Amino acid sequence: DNTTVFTRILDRLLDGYDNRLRPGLGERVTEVKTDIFVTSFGPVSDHDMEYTIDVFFRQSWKDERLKFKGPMTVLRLNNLMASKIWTPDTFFHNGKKSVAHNMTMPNKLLRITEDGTLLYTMRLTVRAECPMHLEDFPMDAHACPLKFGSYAYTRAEVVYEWTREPARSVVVAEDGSRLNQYDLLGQTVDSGIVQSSTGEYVVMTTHFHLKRKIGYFVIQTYLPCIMTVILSQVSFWLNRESVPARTVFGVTTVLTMTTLSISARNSLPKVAYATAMDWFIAVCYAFVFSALIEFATVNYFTKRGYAWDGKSVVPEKKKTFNSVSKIDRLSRIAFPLLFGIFNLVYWATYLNR
Amino acid sequence: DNTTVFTRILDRLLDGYDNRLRPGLGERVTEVKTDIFVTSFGPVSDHDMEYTIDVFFRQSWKDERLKFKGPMTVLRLNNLMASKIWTPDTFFHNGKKSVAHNMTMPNKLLRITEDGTLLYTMRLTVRAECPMHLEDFPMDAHACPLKFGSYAYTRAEVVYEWTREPARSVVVAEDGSRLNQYDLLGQTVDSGIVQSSTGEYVVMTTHFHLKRKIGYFVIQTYLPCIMTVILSQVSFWLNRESVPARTVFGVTTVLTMTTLSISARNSLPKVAYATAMDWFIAVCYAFVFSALIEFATVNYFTKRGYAWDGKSVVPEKKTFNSVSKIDRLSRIAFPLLFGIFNLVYWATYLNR
Amino acid sequence: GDVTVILNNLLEGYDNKLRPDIGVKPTLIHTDMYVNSIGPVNAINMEYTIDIFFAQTWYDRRLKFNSTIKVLRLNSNMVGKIWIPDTFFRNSKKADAHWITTPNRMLRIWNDGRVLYTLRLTIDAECQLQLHNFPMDEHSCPLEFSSYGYPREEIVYQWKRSSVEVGDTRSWRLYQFSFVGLRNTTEVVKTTSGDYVVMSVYFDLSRRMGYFTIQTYIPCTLIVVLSWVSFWINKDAVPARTSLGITTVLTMTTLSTIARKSLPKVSYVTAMDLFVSVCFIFVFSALVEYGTLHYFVSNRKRIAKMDSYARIFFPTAFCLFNLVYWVSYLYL
Amino acid sequence: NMSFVKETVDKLLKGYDIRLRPDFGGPPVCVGMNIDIASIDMVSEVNMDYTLTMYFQQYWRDKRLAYSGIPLNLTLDNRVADQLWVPDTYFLNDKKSFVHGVTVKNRMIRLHPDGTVLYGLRITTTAACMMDLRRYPLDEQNCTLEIESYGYTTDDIEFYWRGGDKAVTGVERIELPQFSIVEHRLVSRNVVFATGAYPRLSLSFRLKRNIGYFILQTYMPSILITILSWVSFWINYDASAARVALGITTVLTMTTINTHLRETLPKIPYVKAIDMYLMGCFVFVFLALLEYAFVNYIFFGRGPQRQKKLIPDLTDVNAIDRWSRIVFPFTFSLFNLVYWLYYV
Amino acid sequence: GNMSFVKETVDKLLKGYDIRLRPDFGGPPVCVGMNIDIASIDMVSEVNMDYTLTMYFQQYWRDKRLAYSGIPLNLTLDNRVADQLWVPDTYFLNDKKSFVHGVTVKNRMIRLHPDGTVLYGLRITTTAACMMDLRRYPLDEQNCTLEIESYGYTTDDIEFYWRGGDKAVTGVERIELPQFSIVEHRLVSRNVVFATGAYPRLSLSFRLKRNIGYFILQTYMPSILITILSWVSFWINYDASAARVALGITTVLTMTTINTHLRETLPKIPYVKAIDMYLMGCFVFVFLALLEYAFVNYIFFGRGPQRQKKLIPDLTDVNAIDRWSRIVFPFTFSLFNLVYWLYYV
Numbered sequence A: 001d002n003t004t005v006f007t008r009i010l011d012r013l014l015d016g017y018d019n020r021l022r023p024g025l026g027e028r029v030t031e032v033k034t035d036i037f038v039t040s041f042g043p044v045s046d047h048d049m050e051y052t053i054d055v056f057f058r059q060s061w062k063d064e065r066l067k068f069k070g071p072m073t074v075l076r077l078n079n080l081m082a083s084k085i086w087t088p089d090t091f092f093h094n095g096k097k098s099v100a101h102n103m104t105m106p107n108k109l110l111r112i113t114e115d116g117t118l119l120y121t122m123r124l125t126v127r128a129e130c131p132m133h134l135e136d137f138p139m140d141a142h143a144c145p146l147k148f149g150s151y152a153y154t155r156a157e158v159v160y161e162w163t164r165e166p167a168r169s170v171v172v173a174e175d176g177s178r179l180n181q182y183d184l185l186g187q188t189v190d191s192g193i194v195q196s197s198t199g200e201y202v203v204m205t206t207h208f209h210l211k212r213k214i215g216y217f218v219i220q221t222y223l224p225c226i227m228t229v230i231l232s233q234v235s236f237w238l239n240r241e242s243v244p245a246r247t248v249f250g251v252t253t254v255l256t257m258t259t260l261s262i263s264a265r266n267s268l269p270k271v272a273y274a275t276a277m278d279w280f281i282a283v284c285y286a287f288v289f290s291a292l293i294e295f296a297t298v299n300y301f302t303k304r305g306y307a308w309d310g311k312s313v314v315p316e317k318k319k320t321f322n323s324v325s326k327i328d329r330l331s332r333i334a335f336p337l338l339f340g341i342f343n344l345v346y347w348a349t350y351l352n353r
Numbered sequence B: 001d002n003t004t005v006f007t008r009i010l011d012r013l014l015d016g017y018d019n020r021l022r023p024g025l026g027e028r029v030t031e032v033k034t035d036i037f038v039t040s041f042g043p044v045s046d047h048d049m050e051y052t053i054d055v056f057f058r059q060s061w062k063d064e065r066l067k068f069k070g071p072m073t074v075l076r077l078n079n080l081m082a083s084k085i086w087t088p089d090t091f092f093h094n095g096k097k098s099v100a101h102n103m104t105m106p107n108k109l110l111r112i113t114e115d116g117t118l119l120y121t122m123r124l125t126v127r128a129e130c131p132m133h134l135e136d137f138p139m140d141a142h143a144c145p146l147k148f149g150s151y152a153y154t155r156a157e158v159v160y161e162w163t164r165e166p167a168r169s170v171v172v173a174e175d176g177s178r179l180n181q182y183d184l185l186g187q188t189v190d191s192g193i194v195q196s197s198t199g200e201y202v203v204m205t206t207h208f209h210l211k212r213k214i215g216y217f218v219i220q221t222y223l224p225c226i227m228t229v230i231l232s233q234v235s236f237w238l239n240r241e242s243v244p245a246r247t248v249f250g251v252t253t254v255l256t257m258t259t260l261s262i263s264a265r266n267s268l269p270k271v272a273y274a275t276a277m278d279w280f281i282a283v284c285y286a287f288v289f290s291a292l293i294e295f296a297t298v299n300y301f302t303k304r305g306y307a308w309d310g311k312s313v314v315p316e317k318k319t320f321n322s323v324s325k326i327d328r329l330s331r332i333a334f335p336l337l338f339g340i341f342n343l344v345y346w347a348t349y350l351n352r
Numbered sequence C: 001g002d003v004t005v006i007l008n009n010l011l012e013g014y015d016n017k018l019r020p021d022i023g024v025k026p027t028l029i030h031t032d033m034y035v036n037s038i039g040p041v042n043a044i045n046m047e048y049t050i051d052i053f054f055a056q057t058w059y060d061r062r063l064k065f066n067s068t069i070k071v072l073r074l075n076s077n078m079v080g081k082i083w084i085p086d087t088f089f090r091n092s093k094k095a096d097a098h099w100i101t102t103p104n105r106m107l108r109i110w111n112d113g114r115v116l117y118t119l120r121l122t123i124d125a126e127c128q129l130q131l132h133n134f135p136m137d138e139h140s141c142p143l144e145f146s147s148y149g150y151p152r153e154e155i156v157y158q159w160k161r162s163s164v165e166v167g168d169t170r171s172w173r174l175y176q177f178s179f180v181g182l183r184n185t186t187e188v189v190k191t192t193s194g195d196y197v198v199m200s201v202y203f204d205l206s207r208r209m210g211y212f213t214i215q216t217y218i219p220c221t222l223i224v225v226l227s228w229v230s231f232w233i234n235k236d237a238v239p240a241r242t243s244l245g246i247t248t249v250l251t252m253t254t255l256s257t258i259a260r261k262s263l264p265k266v267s268y269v270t271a272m273d274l275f276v277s278v279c280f281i282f283v284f285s286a287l288v289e290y291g292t293l294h295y296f297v298s299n300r301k302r303i304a305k306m307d308s309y310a311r312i313f314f315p316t317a318f319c320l321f322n323l324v325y326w327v328s329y330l331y332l
Numbered sequence D: 001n002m003s004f005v006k007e008t009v010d011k012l013l014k015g016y017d018i019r020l021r022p023d024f025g026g027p028p029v030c031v032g033m034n035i036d037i038a039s040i041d042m043v044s045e046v047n048m049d050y051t052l053t054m055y056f057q058q059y060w061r062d063k064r065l066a067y068s069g070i071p072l073n074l075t076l077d078n079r080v081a082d083q084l085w086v087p088d089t090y091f092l093n094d095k096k097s098f099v100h101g102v103t104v105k106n107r108m109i110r111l112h113p114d115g116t117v118l119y120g121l122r123i124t125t126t127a128a129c130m131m132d133l134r135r136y137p138l139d140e141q142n143c144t145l146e147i148e149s150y151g152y153t154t155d156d157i158e159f160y161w162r163g164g165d166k167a168v169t170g171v172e173r174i175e176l177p178q179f180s181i182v183e184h185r186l187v188s189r190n191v192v193f194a195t196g197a198y199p200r201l202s203l204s205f206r207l208k209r210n211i212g213y214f215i216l217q218t219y220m221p222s223i224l225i226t227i228l229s230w231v232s233f234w235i236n237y238d239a240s241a242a243r244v245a246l247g248i249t250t251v252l253t254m255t256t257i258n259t260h261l262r263e264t265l266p267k268i269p270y271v272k273a274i275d276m277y278l279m280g281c282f283v284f285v286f287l288a289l290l291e292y293a294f295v296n297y298i299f300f301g302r303g304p305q306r307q308k309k310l311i312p313d314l315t316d317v318n319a320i321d322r323w324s325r326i327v328f329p330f331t332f333s334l335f336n337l338v339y340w341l342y343y344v
Numbered sequence E: 001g002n003m004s005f006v007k008e009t010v011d012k013l014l015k016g017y018d019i020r021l022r023p024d025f026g027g028p029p030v031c032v033g034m035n036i037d038i039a040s041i042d043m044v045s046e047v048n049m050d051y052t053l054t055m056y057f058q059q060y061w062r063d064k065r066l067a068y069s070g071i072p073l074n075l076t077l078d079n080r081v082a083d084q085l086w087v088p089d090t091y092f093l094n095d096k097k098s099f100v101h102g103v104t105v106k107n108r109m110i111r112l113h114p115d116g117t118v119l120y121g122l123r124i125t126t127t128a129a130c131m132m133d134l135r136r137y138p139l140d141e142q143n144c145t146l147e148i149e150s151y152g153y154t155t156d157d158i159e160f161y162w163r164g165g166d167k168a169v170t171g172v173e174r175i176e177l178p179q180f181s182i183v184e185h186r187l188v189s190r191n192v193v194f195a196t197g198a199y200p201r202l203s204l205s206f207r208l209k210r211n212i213g214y215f216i217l218q219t220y221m222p223s224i225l226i227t228i229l230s231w232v233s234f235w236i237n238y239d240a241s242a243a244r245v246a247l248g249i250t251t252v253l254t255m256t257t258i259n260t261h262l263r264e265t266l267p268k269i270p271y272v273k274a275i276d277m278y279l280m281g282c283f284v285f286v287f288l289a290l291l292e293y294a295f296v297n298y299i300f301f302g303r304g305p306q307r308q309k310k311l312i313p314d315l316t317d318v319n320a321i322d323r324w325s326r327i328v329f330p331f332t333f334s335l336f337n338l339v340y341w342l343y344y345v
């Protein structure tokens, strides 16, 4: 049997090993090198201000107690032996009940080099806080953070560093994107120190930059509002004696704008400030209500309740007929031009920034 | 001491026992007698095509390694000692996510008779798949299955049987009903063999027969549709010169039928075929457009734009429009056809 | 190793089933709390979420040791080996610790026997809300904790002066509420098992009305203003003013229906309900005005000037009602 | 002294057999129980269940755990409960339950010098409660929690309420937004199964629904729409567009209100009390529209015939309108009086 | 075949067994043959972009340490022995959530054979990600895959293969999804290069075709019928402004409501779907129908007095415009339907 030597080496590895103590205790500071491979950037939840990310999290350190000699250079350790060895107690500061995958077996691995170098990899699904400012919604951008560090060990005991330079130490898979209404522009990587009542701790931070895609909201909200505003202006071209028809135009357009405003806010969380979409909806409501007020003003000055018969002739100022309203003729030009100017100003203001 | 022989027997019961091997391995087939007491038939989810059931599951078998002699005739084993012996690896073939209750303690019981007979009872909640065909919805009936058997042992190793006659081995409690829109007519019990890539396995099956209650949908969908259809016909009795009013009748009834059609399928899975309710809604929809098209045709043949003033006189054939003969015929034809359609529909669907 | 032998010696003869000073005096616990964030306030379920670092300090004479090392800093490995208080949150509906990547706990033992034990927790805590002044309501939500089994004669908890502390509240998940302040209290609660020292932290929250102004108040006011346009239309246009009236009434009914979606099914009148009901009364009266005007003008035959009177009366009454309502509910 | 207490506790657990009940060959163990209700969370009509948080305490004597020389109640660490026999209590109608586990398992074990054991748990449990909604929302419900022993019979274990009628406390402090607790009851009996008798305890609550929410949500909108339907009676008969618009709008609004109200709640097959009121309002508005349909038909289909030839009278639209004005409010008031006297 | 002899054999096999070493630790790679029996595919979700799948997952591999003689039958052992034996570190790469069923016991199978072959079976339900391209929705076809990989072992240690070839996966033909139909399934075996070393990989892919029957009843027919409803306006006289305006306003608002309501039950994708194109076309049709009457009314009541004072269809005659609309609107709608259905189907 050629496998007895390996069993002998594995049996004697943990002789006198105390896993309650970090490596190099009382002699130096434990050095942990970390790197992250994001296999997919999960969906972003605006209602919860949370985002999901599935990662391969790799840590590496040195433990002189676990040195060995033999024909083999690297030893793989099973889960039972890995639980009997000290490992860093890394945790995510802004975590929201992440999950460690356990199908078919615990998706983690521990390797030991002959010189005492430990490599420890695991597969995680991290849900993390991404607080948002939705003032520029739906044309806003965010920088979602991911911060992690040791829970119990201060900077005088355990310190974290990036394996490569910080830019290249977090690698995102090319095909690993699960975003529907966002674009991952890039990431920034940094490290620092955080104070607390228990002491000073090392923190490793990664910001992911996201930009919202406006395509869904253009179809959902903006275009119906524009069509409603255009529809309200069609009433200017009807004869002033069609009182019920123009009233129907006004009331139906106002009701449609109210319904659109109510439906539009269902996407966001219930924030207590106005977004960019709210201003657009408010201006469109103002235009529709102004069109109805214009009809009311026109109806105020209408004298006769009957329309033009069809056969009679109207002289210049027997049976007489109402004249075409001057308010209607001016409104036909004023309303579309002002709405177009407002659209130009709005889209220039919000898209450029 | 009085309470020392029991401790001695319990200690000596497990000496030399190997729980990795089934009873009679390599000598005979292990026979398991099974029975079920349904404490409550849980709700049925049409959208997910599944149902919940709460049961007391009883299994019994023979283990000659565990026979004993003493003052007692039957012993009870706690959860730890119960975990130290062999038990069947029974599982539900169509189960989705089952639960074994353990409040306050594990809801399990293991009893051993002096001859070596083991009785093992558990309390379970099982969510099981019940595929449904909804062509006759909401007047449809289903037979939801519950299948179970050994996961690892083939028919040559473990076989299941019913403790009594198969009909009498599954007992449903009288008060155990948590159904809201279904009636449990009964159940049928059977057993068989299933082939698979690993071998042949014994399967024990129980089909529960359910019939949907139509009361909810009659109020929710059918009566609004019938009222909308009746409403659309009221326009036949208004004078032909009231052009805006009859147009309002037509458009509003059309919108109501469209909304009802959209909302009818809300509480159903996205099946690719038409149910019985869809045909009823479609026929009512056709009736409403028939009424509106009738009004359009009547309006096409109206000459004068003014109605009959209360003072004038209409000479027999200032002139006035006569009452449309399309309206006079439509006043009876539309209700008669709708009544005949309802008679045919409810006759052909209530006894299918 | 020096630390290994010390740890081994400390655990020799230790019995974690027993308190320190089991039959001498009560065990004094000093508590401390860092609030990472106060999650959303779920008004429907009468609960709120909170994330904390919870720390407890006490003395154990069994853990004294003499050595050059003044303190041992340890991860969660030794937490299950020594006695720990059985602290629990009384008003908690659902709580959980954190276990990724490892258990988020920390232990520290000093040479004089002082033990510090900290852990990260996420707690859902019930908060009963009085919604009479909704959406201008303020609440004081508690978070209570005590020992489950040890009465006041055996364990006594205590605050560490500046005990409860918070970080950057701008990053919190509060949207409908703004954090005003907090306070701490201690008391004795009597149960069938004995008397227990219960310690509470009250967080004061004040609702932000900006969302509801957009959602309910502005649309209802706009519909009420729309109902007044009927007073300027010609009285001969019977279908037009009738259409205005019915459209305003239906829209107000729909707004009333959807205003209550966020709230729970309380059985009393909130401040929003009064506003919606008054708007309903005004639009209904606007329709009834034209009804009586039409009946007196045509169907039946100062009354003719009803539109002129209404043009002044309705806006003035609406403004007066708004002034009284807002002054009553905001200032007084 | 901790050394003496440690020695006593070690003595008690040495030789203890967890597999045997306190009096194995003797009379049955009398297990007293009491409950302290911390909260009653949402009572769901859709799921037909209610959630209950409680402190559940059991009391029983065990001679093996008696100790002397220590005049104290030894409150031990909760982990030692795994080393002692405890009753196999469970709940029949429970669907999902758990013991809270922060910061540690919310579990208490306390010994007394005479061998008495107090065992406490903090339990949140969802329990089934089938509801009869025929009188909804003017209905009362009776929701129960059953407590039983899984394995033992009356010859081995006996249950009783510790403190009699005062066993369950904290009920008066409960408040629900939608319900009011009017009464709670305790029952103890022995269910005679085929294999002997089993002890049973039962905690029942009677819940009365609050009507105030539904008055604002459904009843007042329906009444207001029905009153709106009567405005058509004061409009001139020849204004067909306005009256038809009123009638159609009111009818469709009533249908919409009924449908949206019935969207919630389970798909029960029978008619609720709210459904009766909504159907009555629908009938009233439908009759209001049919009134104008009849008036218009009478005018524009009998005037030419009456002129050529030459309860209220059927040949005068004004008389029909006046009769409707008088009769519709009176009939609606009578219907409301009959409805509200019947269900209250 | 006495139990005592089998007990002796089983004790002998597990004595000195090292769980930490693979079956052929010093030798060539150990070949693991996998096969799957699909029990059901439950919830294909566009909102979450994933699908749920329940299966019996079996792995076969030869272990010379476990070879036994004398007993001529295959030994099915209690499932708890799996913890005492080496098993492959297999995992699913695109898994979001999964578990092994655990009632009445852990649904796990260990079977040994005289030559040392080990069969290890698990009943697993898995939620797996599937990013769906919804441009042609609801006339779309989706490709959803399950990837199987080894966490730590490279090709020098473990090899994967589908045992039985194309027949490795079973039960696909018996699945009945209400919204989809399984057109094809494929098995792929390959070696990925994630670093300096090759890793085995297996892939089970399915191609799903969506059923159009639900959408025909839900979306297409109501929109077509509303579009047909608008054309009734062309048969009413020009002077009946209330009726025609009511008809047009009702049609356009109903189309807007349908379009808004439909899209809320799907993820907020930024691009235009096939259903959106149809709804937008119907909206344009009803909008043009209303603008037709607006133009007719304007022509009459704003160029009749001027033309009388002064003194494609003919722009002066309102009736000619109406008749032209009667002929042209159905024809154009039918042409649009033809072009739409030919392009996507």
Ligand SMILES: *[C@@H]1O[C@H](CO)[C@@H](O[C@@H]2O[C@H](CO)[C@@H](O[C@@H]3O[C@H](CO[C@H]4O[C@H](CO[C@H]5O[C@H](CO)[C@@H](O)[C@H](O)[C@@H]5O[C@H]5O[C@H](CO)[C@@H](O)[C@H](O)[C@@H]5O)[C@@H](O)[C@H](O[C@H]5O[C@H](CO)[C@@H](O)[C@H](O)[C@@H]5O)[C@@H]4O)[C@@H](O)[C@H](O[C@H]4O[C@H](CO)[C@@H](O)[C@H](O)[C@@H]4O[C@H]4O[C@H](CO)[C@@H](O)[C@H](O)[C@@H]4O[C@H]4O[C@H](CO)[C@@H](O)[C@H](O)[C@@H]4O)[C@@H]3O)[C@H](O)[C@H]2NC(C)=O)[C@H](O)[C@H]1NC(C)=O
Pocket: A079, A083, A100, A101, A102, A106, B102, B103, B104, B105, B106, C076, C077, C078, C079, C080, C081, C095, C096, C097, C099, C103, D099, D100, D101, D102
């Ligand atoms: C009804 O039935 C239920 C189902 O059967 C039943 O449920 C369970 O109860 C048990 C016991 O009460 C629970 O077990 C405790 O769980 C703790 C962890 O809890 C969380 O995690 C589990 C999932 O857990 C595993 O996963 C965690 C990570 O989450 C790992 O940390 C664990 O090691 C373990 O590992 C595997 O899986 C991982 C992937 O998940 C892999 O990555 C990993 O590699 C492992 O393979 C969740 O399920 C929990 O959720 C639930 O519970 C909470 C609270 O109740 C609920 O709020 C929530 O909603 C969920 O319902 C939770 O999230 C364990 O830490 C704990 O084990 C400790 O203590 C015991 C002694 O009591 C020790 O024997 C044990 O070794 C553990 O610790 C030691 O370690 C601690 C911590 O480091 C030390 O402080 C301590 O000193 C001690 O150290 C000593 O010994 C070590 C031995 O090796 C040594 O190494 C040390 O160096 C030292 O010397 C315990 O297992 C279980 O979680 C419940 N849930 C389930 C699903 O089983 C329920 O109780 C029944 N109820 C009734 C009334 O009958």
Ligand SMILES: CCCCCCCC/C=C/CCCCCCCC(=O)O[C@H](COC(=O)CCCCCCCCCCCCCCC)COP(=O)(O)OC[C@@H](O)CO
Pocket: A212, A213, A214, A215, A216, A218, A219, A222, A223, A224, A226, A227, A230, A336, A339, A340, A343, A347, E255, E256, E259, E270, E271, E272, E280, E283, E284
């Ligand atoms: C139910 C109603 C049905 C109405 C339908 C009527 C039919 C006619 C309409 C067709 C709509 C066309 C839909 C266009 C596709 C939807 C919008 C879209 O996705 O295009 C983007 C540009 O958007 C943008 O510039 C944002 C700005 C576009 C705003 C367009 C509105 C023009 C309003 C002018 C005022 C006129 C007033 C009238 C005055 C006379 C492309 O960006 P890019 O690929 O880089 O992705 C980056 C990231 O932002 C996601 O896109």
Ligand SMILES: CCCCCCCC(=O)OC[C@H](COP(=O)(O)O[C@@H]1[C@H](O)[C@H](O)[C@@H](OP(=O)(O)O)[C@H](OP(=O)(O)O)[C@H]1O)OC(=O)CCCCCCC
Pocket: A293, A297, A298, A301, A302, A303, A317, A321, A322, A323, A324, A325, A326, A327, A328, A330, A331, A334
């Ligand atoms: C919110 C309050 C707003 C108050 C606005 C108050 C607006 C205001 O001052 O109205 C007066 C007038 C109404 O004009 P309009 O054409 O509607 O009405 C004609 C006007 O009243 C003539 O005076 C009448 O002739 P006459 O004298 O009897 O011989 C003629 O009678 P008939 O021939 O039909 O019989 C009427 O039809 O409007 C403007 O000219 C302003 C145009 C630009 C207005 C701005 C447009 C954007």
Ligand SMILES: CCCCCCCC(=O)OC[C@H](COP(=O)(O)O[C@@H]1[C@H](O)[C@H](O)[C@@H](OP(=O)(O)O)[C@H](OP(=O)(O)O)[C@H]1O)OC(=O)CCCCCCC
Pocket: B293, B294, B297, B298, B301, B303, B320, B321, B322, B323, B324, B325, B326, B329, B330, B333
């Ligand atoms: C169930 C349907 C029943 C239909 C049965 C069909 C009943 C049927 O035969 O009606 C004929 C109908 C028009 O009849 P309707 O009564 O509407 O119109 C009268 C008719 O045009 C007379 O000819 C006119 O008298 P005159 O001599 O010119 O002076 C009279 O004018 P006046 O007296 O006002 O001056 C008009 O009122 O023309 C069709 O094409 C109907 C297509 C039916 C399509 C049906 C659409 C659904």
Ligand SMILES: CCCCCCCCCCCC(=O)OC[C@H](COP(=O)([O-])O)OC(=O)CCCCCCCCCCC
Pocket: B230, B233, B234, B237, B331, B332, B335, B336, B339, D290, D293, D294, D297, D301
């Ligand atoms: C299941 C099949 C049922 C079919 C039953 C059909 C019976 C009713 C059909 C109409 C028959 C009829 O014309 O006589 C009703 C009388 C006299 O009418 P006329 O022919 O002399 O103009 O005029 C009247 O007095 C009738 C009252 C009309 C009131 C207007 C509203 C009618 C509501 C219509 C509901 C669909």
Ligand SMILES: CCCCCCCCCCCCCCCC
Pocket: A257, A258, A261, A272, A273, A274, A278, A279, A281, A282, A285, C210, C213, C214, C218, C219, C222
């Ligand atoms: C935080 C203070 C907010 C004060 C209200 C801001 C209103 C901004 C205009 C948005 C109006 C809603 C859209 C129109 C609804 C018909």
Ligand SMILES: CCCCCC
Pocket: A290, A291, A293, A294, A297, A327
């Ligand atoms: C503010 C709208 C004015 C309309 C023209 C008088």
Ligand SMILES: [Cl-]
Pocket: A043, A044, A178, A179, A180, A181, A182
């Ligand atoms: Cl996203």
Ligand SMILES: [Cl-]
Pocket: B042, B043, B044, B045, B178, B179, B180, B181, B182
């Ligand atoms: Cl049901």
Ligand SMILES: [Cl-]
Pocket: C039, C040, C041, C042, C173, C174, C175, C176, C177
């Ligand atoms: Cl909030």
